[PDB]
Ligand SMILES: CC(=O)SCCNC(=O)CCNC(=O)[C@H](O)C(C)(C)COP(=O)(O)OP(=O)(O)OC[C@H]1O[C@@H](n2cnc3c(N)ncnc32)[C@H](O)[C@@H]1OP(=O)(O)O
């Protein structure tokens with residue numbers, strides 16, 4: 122019954138049960154190494170570990186870097202221990218996360234922010250190496266201390282950048298958590314309105330939008346419906362560009378320039 | 394390559410491949 126964790130300089134309340142070994146669980150308090158994600162039972166043991174631990178960032182390859190923001194690609198097979206610890210840590214904040222131990226079939230995309238002591242964990246998403254259903258995200262998490270600052274949408278944007286470069290369309294693995302659904306709705310909205318703002322033509326197929334954005338046709342239609350931009354006039358379906366939504370976006374996109382909370386495709390260095 | 398949706402009380406079936414017209418809020 123873990124209530125709290127000490128993670129670097131933060132003290133975080135947990136949301137859900139995670140299956141940590143019982144003799145850790147019963148303390149109700151875990152001390153975590155912020156770099157290798159090893160869990161320990163006291164401050165003093167943590168302090169001892171930090172003196173020995175060489176890790177200043179996630180394992181795997183740094184495939185994105187824009188200044189202090191990185192994304193590391195970590196192979197569940199090559200770095201089993203790290204990926205399990207990450208999954209156990211994630212399940213403290215995920216209601217729905219199934220698995221924690223069998224991480225070999227998964228890639229983990231771990232987003233970090235650098236300061237003078239190292240590259241600190243912001244969040245991550247996991248991805249099946251080979252998904253039967255072409256899911257481009259399995260679970261996604263922003264660490265609580267970083268929530269609602271724009272990092273989540275950057276992680277989501279990053280998941281779709283990978284899909285674009287793979288020349289696939291993608292979708293998050295069902296089921297979507299409540300906060301998952303909200304974040305994805307905000308992102309889908311943003312990219313759909315951006316597309317329609319830039320697009321000059323007289324008509325588009327859902328297919329064409331999906332091809333550009335890597336977003337799944339169903340998710341596009343779902344968003345069009347959400348914004349009440351699908352209509353039916355004289356026996357055919359029309360995309361209705363709402364002026365309120367247009368004006369709202371250019372306003373929201375005027376503050377997106379000075380935000381710095383943006384994934385920049387030119388800062389990716391990756392091949393599947 | 395279809396989808397089902399309810400728009401203002403009606404129920405509709407929409408193709409993914411068919412181009413749909415873009416309107417700029419007219420009658
Ligand atoms: C397939 C799956 O993995 S589904 C599981 C998803 N993961 C989880 O539920 C685990 C816990 N949740 C999280 O870690 C986070 O909520 C995430 C990853 C879903 C989103 O991360 P964040 O860093 O908070 O996202 P970001 O800062 O980019 O904000 C995302 C959008 O969601 C909204 N949002 C985020 N949290 C909340 C909240 N508690 N209440 C209302 N809105 C919220 C933001 O307002 C924004 O939308 P807007 O621009 O339309 O207002």
Ligand SMILES: [Zn+2]
Pocket residue numbers: 154155156157158159170174175176
């Ligand atoms: Zn360590």
